[PDB]
Design an enzyme around this catalytic site. Structure first.
Site, PDB file in Angstrom:
ATOM      1  N   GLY A   1     -24.719   1.873  45.865  1.00 28.37           N
ATOM      2  CA  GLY A   1     -25.842   2.171  45.004  1.00 28.37           C
ATOM      3  C   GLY A   1     -25.510   2.299  43.523  1.00 28.37           C
ATOM      4  O   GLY A   1     -24.698   1.535  42.997  1.00 28.37           O
TER       5      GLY A   1
ATOM      6  N   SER B   1     -19.351  -0.961  48.177  1.00 26.00           N
ATOM      7  CA  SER B   1     -19.514  -0.622  46.784  1.00 26.00           C
ATOM      8  C   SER B   1     -19.289   0.858  46.499  1.00 26.00           C
ATOM      9  O   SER B   1     -18.222   1.385  46.796  1.00 26.00           O
ATOM     10  CB  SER B   1     -20.904  -1.056  46.303  1.00 26.00           C
ATOM     11  N   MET B   2     -20.270   1.534  45.911  1.00 32.26           N
ATOM     12  CA  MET B   2     -20.070   2.931  45.591  1.00 32.26           C
ATOM     13  C   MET B   2     -19.724   3.724  46.827  1.00 32.26           C
ATOM     14  O   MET B   2     -19.269   4.852  46.724  1.00 32.26           O
ATOM     15  CB  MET B   2     -21.301   3.509  44.902  1.00 32.26           C
TER      16      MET B   2
ATOM     17  N   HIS C   1     -16.177  -4.401  45.498  1.00 35.60           N
ATOM     18  CA  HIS C   1     -16.508  -5.419  44.518  1.00 35.60           C
ATOM     19  C   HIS C   1     -16.748  -4.796  43.175  1.00 35.60           C
ATOM     20  O   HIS C   1     -16.477  -3.602  42.995  1.00 35.60           O
ATOM     21  CB  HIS C   1     -17.687  -6.283  44.979  1.00 35.60           C
TER      22      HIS C   1
ATOM     23  N   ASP D   1     -17.212  -9.901  46.426  1.00 37.20           N
ATOM     24  CA  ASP D   1     -17.313  -9.049  47.601  1.00 37.20           C
ATOM     25  C   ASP D   1     -16.153  -9.335  48.529  1.00 37.20           C
ATOM     26  O   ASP D   1     -15.863 -10.504  48.862  1.00 37.20           O
ATOM     27  CB  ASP D   1     -18.587  -9.282  48.391  1.00 37.20           C
TER      28      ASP D   1
END
Lengths: 179, 179, 179, 179, 179, 179, 179, 179, 179, 179, 179
Positions: E54, E83-84, E108, E157
């Site tokens: 997010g 991600s986060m 990523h 990614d």
């Protein structure tokens, strides 16, 4: 003049089948053919094809018409001819089916869907099955392969390069330059 | 004449390719080229290009037709030529590809998307790659760059100015003033 | 006759640049321009600009066409002319760039926008920057102001009345009464 | 014969300005004006006006065009002339501005809006105060009224009947019966 | 009572980070960490992560919050950590981070976008580049990898099974059976 | 010229019926027949039917018209003919109703629906039952089946290949080739 | 020709009234009639009806034009004439009102609805009752039924087949074959 | 008490997985799972399953939690359990997985999609395939079916009624009456 | 208390099945059964049904549980019971299936549909045909009617009053007035 | 403690039926009734009614319940009682059915609407008429009118002020004050 | 208490009628009154009114209840009381109807709307007039004004200031300071 370019080209017996296949653009194709058969019922008629596919019945009004008219409808694919598009390409006069260098083809079985009472679903799926049956038959025919062979190759989306296309039997040869 | 400025300029063998690239506007390009060929197979054809790109099949129907026909198709870039716009730009006859001083070019790899079952995702995933591959070959040809110079540079959005595009083999020279 | 006012107005070599500058309205302008060069590559072409600006690449297609073609392109600003509009205005042939008494001009910097991965924001931003800089050069050059000065005045929106525009070097004189 | 009613009226040197004033219908009016001046720079041009108003800079392209062309542009208000429409009506050649008996007039001040950073808000707010000044200046020039009778009169919507517009100096007389 | 199930696990110091990372849920997670430290600053805190990631600043309040509180925040990933999510997963106390057998990680780079003048865009492309650098650094620290290795690996990614997460250094080991 | 293809083909007494059957298109088809009858009440009229059906009152306006004009109406089905479309095909001139090779026919019973008080529900439901009875009779008399037989096969959708449309008596034969 | 089929048939003095009855379509009908009277006030006008009804005042502008012109307006129902449809059908020149065999007519009472103050509701409802009375009066008149009968037969929808139509006095006879 | 029915049945160590599998509903299931083990890690847990499937990762967070807590997890399908519902069902304690008499099970491969650059499409297709395999392995593992057998059986949706389920190895037995 | 009317009625062993049948409300009702069982297995559970029906598998999740628990489940119809609603009422404890005086029942075959490839289509079509069969068999079982008779009467919507219901063996008797 | 006003009144045995009648607000009234009987089967229940009508099966579920519970159900109308609203009002215990002074009653016929094949449309339309007939007999039975008087009086909307409902027998008396 | 401010004030025999009048809020108001009568049938009840009106039947339900309960009901208007608000305001206990100083009262006739058959329009139109007559009679009863006088000041909106409403006899006095 060059007011309408598809018209000037029609006079050269060139018909374009572009994008989505459906009743109205199909009906327009069909009438363009009947018109070229009345003009001169001997000369070939050229049909360019760049289409993702579309509605089956709409496709068979085009197919049955190509076979029905005396003129030989040569077929030439530019860009792409997927599903019923590819069906129509290979439905062209024998020896008169082409593919430009980087055009691509994709084949696959019929798609559909109904909504209703089990009984009706029965009567409708039974039907989409008869159609798959006839779609495969006609493909074996035009391409040379065998019924068993197609159904195998066609159960899932299948791509063919211009070359692979000729190798497979959908089109007779690759147009590369104007000689 | 001036009744319809594009029709008037087609008479001077000039075709414009403006905006998003899709089956229909592309069909119209193919039809103007086929038509010019039929009127005079020896004279150049000028394809002015100002596009951000679009659908690859639609474009390839334009690249094959460009190459296929007998006439030489010179390409003039005005405003911008990106992605399929830069491909098509670079695909004009050798020596006859130009850029105006402030045209800006951008090249990058293919974009796509599929939705479905992993199996099908497989076919589609591998076809998009087969396409990126043929596309990179053709950019090698028309530019002189090595297949590996292009996969490298198109791996991501790459901006080229007029002189850089000349310096890179995308176009042959920059047109500043008519003489 | 006067079937189509603009068609008719073109016979007098008058092309109109109205509304937002975007790809198709620009190509239409670039064609009227190449068309007028064809009728007489010697006589001046008059461009009426009444626009709040628009797409930079589209505007540069018009700009490069103006500089390229043989005839002098006279610019006349009516209503307003801002950003790319002001730019195309000052790009008319020096000595033949005008403002109507109550026209108004507005200059500022390229307005852009991107979405994506850092690596890609970097590229795309670098490009908006290269462009701002050059646009700035072509602006110092056409007006007569220094590169320092243009940079110093295009950061924030700046309005110029017809008179100030004349004094800033954006236009040459004011057309007030057809004498 | 009236194949194109509006075109036939144009031949009688008549132009209609109906509805909102915006860039395009405004451009159309300019072009009808330049074309009527081209046809005969000596003849009066008649402009019927029935509009609620609209975009100032668009209205100003018609205004400056009216002052520039050689012909006198006689204005005739039917139904209503509000804001830029009122302004455009009183800007016709002195002695030739008219109102139909039951047409109504409305005058006021510039309307506007902005969204952004305070610095920019100021640049834009200051600009609409100048436009307002210049509009007031030109309003006094055409109606005969002084510069403050106008300011004092346009701070809020102000209606004016046919008779009142003759008395205020907006128009020269009422047109009631052809004789 | 098992009135509120999460309020119940919170008493066993268990915290869940589920779904989209955004300001409000992030703030709820931070508040639980602070509250847990208030209750007993010595005892570990378990954070169960199941998220596709997010907002970066939203996640960084958790990151710093984790590092600031006295307790070691132990992180366990289930479902996925992208991600986060992968980031907060690895920022957990050295030695106490895990992946359920079938959870999968993805790493990523920052993503974002801006609209505005060239001058504003540059301040923003610069910034997301500084954010990019601190994340890579913080990722280098936490995984033990080298900066350029982290940079090189995040450009696109990257998926990682839990075993690959353990190898790579995001998590410390794979939890399989309670004992 | 061939500026309107449907218009030329009409010159050969060929009318098309495509897509959903409704008042306007239905009305156009009807006008074409009257028009064709008045041109030569002797020569056959040819109607290609490629429809999924549609509104029954609309279909009947075409029906009565068919059975009313002097010319014999030859119905040819391509693509498909369902419900009303199949009803109008089997409704053509006896011995002149052809069905292309792969056209599929589908016939069934009336679809409808009302909303309101019960007293009106009965009035309207009693009306669709009456229309039903009549369509069955007409389907009986045109196909040669018995009313009882018809009633029994149209309670539910019932498909029919080209060969079956012949056995069943809907059409007379099959056009497979032009000869 | 076959360019504009409906314009073509206007020559045989045939007007089609298809679909919803409303002011603009009604105007075209009126205008077609007035025009056919100007060409020959002696020849019969043929009006084909296929409509489910519409706006009463719209219908009435057609009703009165029929009674006003010198030419008898013969009415021919195709598909259906419901509500205002049955109304204009039964209003053709007595002796010349026809119903095709499977046509079907429907009759009922005026529909409407108002909104607002009570006083106003009484005004508007008191108006629809008059229109009602008047519509039933005129129905008694062309059908021959007692006003008393009419009122009973139209408080609700009532369908009538072609033969039923002829017996009710709505039409004079059924049309079956061109002879 | 029966204040919250779901909380009350939680005391008899019962848990329900109803509807689509997505992170949040999955989390609430995992937490109840952790909660129960925490109250007594010896007694069995009952997870009723009536779902059509859902987000794979969401599902896996549930799976790994099932295999991880000490409590044995007894799965009981009611209504239906397809895709990830099928997988979690056959994932309960060997010997302790069931199927109500008229339960219905469905199995098949992963679904998914992506949009972007050739490079990134590769990475994601590469990933949904690594997942498919792993998902299959695990099916083989829990039903003792040949790894190849599952690959086959899951290329296309396969419905399995309760007995067939028992037989296929998905569940151990069938519960019909509470003895 | 009566702070939650439904919980209080739960306390008298009364469960309500209202509105559409779908997983969550069907799982809610399944949960109430299991809870009431837990609280006393010897006792009767009163399940009211006012439903138009819904998703079969959800209905089934309730049917199986009904059969399965120790408590005899008594069904009571109020308002309506259509489709799954009639199936669930007729599945109540033999001897305890009531129908309030004015409740109406409606039985009919299953509804559904699919969209996709033929192969999948066939797969789903069969499935709904297996489901149809099994329901009919269970209809025969609970109503004492015969499988065949059940196949007949449930092809098209069949309604029945409470007395006809008893008579058909759907419910055992009609409750009228407490005693 | 007036924390919830409706539950407080429920201890006074006062149920409210407010708004449109639909399955859920209906089930709640049923649940309140069964609940109130259970507390004391000998005391009078009071059902206030202010409704515009609603779904019938829903109203019948309320209806039978009223008729079915041991305690008398006194109905009091406030505001309005229309359609099903009116019907549930007159359904109260003979001698205990009140209408407030300015409440207004409205009675009429079942409204419905179906869509589909003619056969199904018949099945539903017969059902809606049986329901009408049964509804009428009930109306007769409670007001003591003749089945025939009720049939006539309901064909169309009929309003009855409070006193008129007293003499029609819908209610036994007007309730003016609490004496 | 104050867990709800309004529940607390209820214990003070204070009820609020705020905003739009419709069935559910009017029911709440009716519930609060019966309840307050049930606590102490002797003491005054206080209904504050700040309303713009709404549904008359919903309103009447509040009116027949105000009269019907034993407690006097004092009405206090704050902000505004228009339409049904003004009606309900004045229908309060003689001598105990107040108006705060700056509240505004507005009055008029019923508003309505309906669609459908002329016959139905009449039925509903009479009704609205009966309602308008009854409302006007009660308005006169309570204000002291003649019937006729009320019919006149109610045809169009009529505002009354606080003091003007004491004069008109709509309220008894004004409140100013708690004295």
């Amino acid at each position: 003049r060059s007011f309408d370019i598809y018209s000037r080209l029609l006079k050269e017996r060139v018909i374009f089948l572009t994008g989505q296949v459906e009743d109205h653009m199909a009906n327009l194709i069909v009438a363009q053919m009947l018109f070229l058969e009345a003009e001169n019922p001997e000369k070939d008629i050229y049909l360019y094809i760049n289409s993702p596919g579309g509605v089956i019945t709409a496709g068979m009004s085009i197919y049955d018409t190509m076979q029905f008219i005396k003129p030989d409808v040569s077929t030439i694919c530019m860009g792409q001819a997927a599903s019923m598009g590819a069906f129509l390409l290979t439905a062209g006069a024998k020896g008169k089916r082409f593919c430009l260098p980087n055009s691509r083809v994709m084949i696959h079985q019929p798609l559909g869907g109904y909504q209703g009472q089990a009984t009706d679903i029965e009567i409708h799926a039974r039907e989409i099955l008869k159609v798959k049956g006839r779609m495969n038959e006609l493909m074996a025919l035009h391409t040379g392969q065998s019924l068993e062979q197609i159904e195998r190759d066609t159960e899932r989306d299948r791509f063919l390069s211009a070359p692979e296309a000729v190798e497979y039997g959908l089109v007779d040869s690759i147009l590369t330059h104007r000689n």
